Enzyme design. Structure first.
Site, PDB file in Angstrom:
ATOM      1  N   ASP A   1     -30.758 -29.147 -65.042  1.00 16.30           N
ATOM      2  CA  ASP A   1     -32.155 -28.775 -65.359  1.00 16.30           C
ATOM      3  C   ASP A   1     -32.809 -29.555 -66.510  1.00 16.30           C
ATOM      4  OD1 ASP A   1     -31.126 -26.815 -63.644  1.00 16.30           O
ATOM      5  OD2 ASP A   1     -31.847 -25.123 -64.843  1.00 16.30           O
TER       6      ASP A   1
ATOM      7  N   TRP B   1     -21.062 -27.840 -62.515  1.00 21.37           N
ATOM      8  CA  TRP B   1     -21.828 -26.952 -63.402  1.00 21.37           C
ATOM      9  C   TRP B   1     -20.903 -26.234 -64.381  1.00 21.37           C
ATOM     10  CZ3 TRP B   1     -21.850 -21.831 -64.751  1.00 21.37           C
ATOM     11  CH2 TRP B   1     -22.989 -21.344 -65.426  1.00 21.37           C
TER      12      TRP B   1
ATOM     13  N   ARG C   1     -34.152 -14.854 -68.449  1.00 20.91           N
ATOM     14  CA  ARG C   1     -34.019 -16.284 -68.744  1.00 20.91           C
ATOM     15  C   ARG C   1     -35.315 -17.092 -68.598  1.00 20.91           C
ATOM     16  NH1 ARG C   1     -30.566 -16.898 -63.137  1.00 20.91           N
ATOM     17  NH2 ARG C   1     -29.225 -15.486 -64.351  1.00 20.91           N
ATOM     18  N   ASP C   2     -35.332 -18.272 -69.227  1.00 23.46           N
ATOM     19  CA  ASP C   2     -36.307 -19.352 -68.949  1.00 23.46           C
ATOM     20  C   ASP C   2     -37.733 -19.133 -69.489  1.00 23.46           C
ATOM     21  OD1 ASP C   2     -33.986 -20.004 -67.526  1.00 23.46           O
ATOM     22  OD2 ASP C   2     -35.015 -20.421 -65.629  1.00 23.46           O
TER      23      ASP C   2
END
Ligand SMILES: *[C@@H]1O[C@H](CO)[C@@H](O[C@@H]2O[C@H](CO)[C@@H](O[C@@H]3O[C@H](CO)[C@@H](O)[C@H](O)[C@@H]3O)[C@H](O)[C@H]2NC(C)=O)[C@H](O[C@@H]2O[C@@H](C)[C@@H](O)[C@@H](O)[C@@H]2O)[C@H]1NC(C)=O
Ligand SMILES: *[C@@H]1O[C@H](CO)[C@@H](O[C@@H]2O[C@H](CO)[C@@H](O[C@@H]3O[C@H](CO)[C@@H](O)[C@H](O)[C@@H]3O)[C@H](O)[C@H]2NC(C)=O)[C@H](O)[C@H]1NC(C)=O
Ligand SMILES: *[C@@H]1O[C@H](CO)[C@@H](O[C@@H]2O[C@H](CO)[C@@H](O)[C@H](O)[C@H]2NC(C)=O)[C@H](O[C@@H]2O[C@@H](C)[C@@H](O)[C@@H](O)[C@@H]2O)[C@H]1NC(C)=O
Ligand SMILES: *[C@@H]1O[C@H](CO)[C@@H](O)[C@H](O[C@@H]2O[C@@H](C)[C@@H](O)[C@@H](O)[C@@H]2O)[C@H]1NC(C)=O
Length: 524
Positions: free
Chosen positions: A27, A51, A150-151
């Site tokens: 990302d 990952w 998140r985010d």
């Protein structure tokens, strides 16, 4: 599994796309322009090309193309981020400060918001980053899972010192975007009104909210609002691993974003890219007054092959975003103009004829590092995904180009138009015969694309070893994919024009540039 050779694997590394020296990258994180440098951060596993063990890599360039590696920016080194540092967004304040919000994960998989900032704002390279001593700063509200919180987005300004940020989540199967207010980026208050919600989408990740102009050809700064301003709302749809956007209006008074077309709302309408393209983030570039979008493209081969070659995943070339003023109902995405600095030499093919069921070789020399611009004319229901690709012949399609092809077409990757019967134009990329290896992606990707009165069918392709990026009608539709040929590599890769329609002949003109390396290397 295919028995990949060292030579087949080595060829897959790109010449001019951003990727680290080795290992896993994913990302985009906190992209900004600062003191003469474009800054890019990214998810990075220092240990393996899979990952995990999440940290932030850091790179800079003068031009969004010629990247230089810098030291690691953020590590997983505190109790509140020991299981990884994730998905950050920067907000740049009027006083010169840079506030970087990120999601940290605990040993219990609990996700919480935290703050980081530069150690030294006088450093144009922003080498060293510091974590706020008051971290972690925000935990999940009662209606949202603490393992799915998140985010945070880049902030937008309201008034009287107050800024807003978005955090995507879900309620049951409904995707949502929450809004929090802050004056210092250290304490946050949840607003009662959601930014927007759409049923049956699932989790919204990586939410982006930004203004676009209805009149000019420039991008807009993130806090701009007014009469000639619309807003894009974007979400990464976790269940699909695909990015969707919609065009609408945002009202500061009510905090509501409303879609121009509810049938094409966030998660059920248009995508930036119909191929492999995820976790996209935009930023405003004050140097050329553009809005630029970053997104990553995962490997489409086996994990076994990734571990053998020692790396995984690349970024696309960054793209500008503008409203399509010809239609009013989609955006235009186009590679940043600096990519043209890689163009070495050109060859032109003028008014090449391709009759029904024909294939025409295009002698360009080496065909692995290319920029291709082509236009097509037809001389005087369907769905890309469920189609037989280039093999499914119709009256008015398919026609286009074959890239990553061998001389005898034992391997080939078609990119094509298909006109279906009120007529619809489809733009597709066919992976079904891209490689003789069985453990790679074999899908057909694509969608319709608007073609307006008087317009020729036009495509641009960027070809760079194991990544192909495609653009129709100046970026009304984009498709990105990965190819892993066993034979169409090095000097053996070729380019063709093809027409597999039964009831149409086509005339095409092309200009093709050989492309240089971006010489991505450590900063010195
Ligand atoms: C063109 O044809 C493709 C392939 O059939 C369509 O995409 C498919 O749409 C299905 C829904 O109609 C998806 O089904 C979902 O499957 C997942 C599990 O994989 C479930 O969790 C979920 O509940 C659904 O049942 C299917 O995943 C999807 N296939 C692919 C490869 O993407 C396509 O439909 C269009 O795209 C999809 C992604 C959705 O946005 C649809 O709303 C949309 O119609 C077909 N295109 C058209 C225009 O009909
Ligand atoms: C233009 O369209 C024709 C007609 O569809 C294409 O020829 C066809 O190609 C397909 C795929 O190669 C052949 O299908 C078979 O697939 C199986 C795998 O499932 C494989 O084992 C077979 O060897 C074969 O490839 C099909 O036989 C063939 N049909 C005909 C009538 O020749 C052609 O490839 C298209 N042109 C381009 C440039 O794609
Ligand atoms: C998510 O789905 C849940 C299961 O359907 C919802 O809870 C249900 O809400 C009903 C009223 O809408 C109520 O009759 C049911 O008893 C209840 N079921 C269970 C197992 O809790 C849930 O709705 C939210 O939570 C409930 C308890 C109420 O506070 C509602 O006002 C809430 O909306 C659904 N969540 C959302 C956000 O819709
Ligand atoms: C992250 O780092 C830790 C500690 O340095 C490694 O142990 C992880 O390696 C993986 O997990 C161990 C237990 C073992 O299974 C090994 O074969 C794995 O590579 C590493 N994790 C990742 C995902 O890279």
């Amino acid at each position: 599994p295919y028995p990949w050779s060292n030579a087949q694997l080595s060829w897959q590394r790109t010449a001019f796309h951003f990727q680290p020296e080795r290992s896993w990258m994913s990302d985009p994180d906190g992209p900004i322009f600062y003191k003469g440098w474009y800054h890019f951060f990214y998810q990075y596993n220092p240990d393996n090309p899979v990952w995990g063990n999440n940290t932030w890599g850091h790179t800079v360039s003068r031009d969004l193309i010629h990247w230089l590696y810098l030291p690691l920016a953020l590590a997983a080194d505190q109790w509140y981020d020991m299981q990884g540092v994730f998905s950050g967004s920067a907000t740049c304040l009027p006083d010169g400060r840079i506030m970087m919000l990120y999601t940290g994960v605990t040993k219990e998989m609990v996700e919480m918001l935290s703050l980081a900032y530069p150690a030294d704002l006088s450093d144009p390279l922003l080498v060293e980053w510091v974590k706020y001593p008051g971290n972690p700063i925000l935990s999940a509200p009662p209606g949202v899972s603490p393992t799915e919180f998140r985010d945070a987005s880049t902030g937008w300004y309201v008034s009287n010192g107050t800024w807003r940020i978005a955090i995507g989540a879900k309620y049951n199967t409904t995707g949502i975007a929450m809004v929090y207010e802050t004056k210092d980026f250290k304490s946050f208050k949840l607003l009662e009104e959601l930014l927007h919600a759409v049923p049956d989408t699932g989790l919204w990740e990586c939410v982006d909210l930004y203004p676009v102009s209805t009149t000019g050809e420039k991008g807009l700064e993130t806090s701009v609002n007014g009469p000639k301003v619309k807003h894009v709302l974007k979400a990464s749809i976790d269940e699909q691993q695909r990015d969707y956007y919609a065009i609408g209006t945002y009202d500061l008074g009510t905090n509501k974003w409303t879609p121009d077309n509810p049938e094409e709302d966030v998660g059920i309408g248009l995508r930036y890219d119909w191929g492999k393209y995820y976790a996209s983030k935009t930023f405003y570039d004050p140097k050329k007054q553009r809005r630029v979008v970053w997104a990553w493209t995962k490997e489409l081969d086996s994990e076994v092959a990734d571990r053998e070659k020692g790396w995984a995943n690349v970024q696309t070339i960054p793209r500008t975003v503008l409203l399509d003023q010809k239609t009013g109902t989609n955006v235009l995405l186009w590679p940043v103009e600096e990519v043209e600095s890689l163009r070495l030499s050109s060859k032109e093919f003028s008014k090449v004829k391709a009759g029904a069921g024909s294939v025409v070789p295009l002698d360009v020399g080496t065909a692995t590092q290319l920029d291709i611009i082509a236009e097509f004319e037809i001389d005087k229901g369907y769905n890309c995904t469920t189609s037989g690709g280039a093999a499914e012949r119709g009256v008015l399609g398919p026609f286009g180009l074959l890239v990553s092809a061998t001389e005898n077409l034992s391997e080939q990757t078609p990119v094509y138009f298909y006109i279906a019967k009120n007529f619809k134009t489809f733009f597709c990329l066919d992976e079904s015969r891209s490689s003789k290896a069985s453990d790679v992606s074999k899908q057909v990707k694509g969608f319709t694309v608007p073609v307006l009165d008087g317009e020729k069918f036009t495509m641009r392709l960027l070809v760079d070893h194991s990544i192909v990026e495609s653009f129709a009608q100046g970026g009304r539709s984009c498709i990105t994919s990965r190819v892993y040929p066993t034979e169409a590599i090095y000097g053996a890769a070729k380019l063709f024009l093809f027409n597999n329609a039964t009831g149409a002949s086509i005339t095409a003109s092309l200009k093709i540039w050989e492309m240089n390396s971006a010489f991505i290397q450590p900063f010195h």
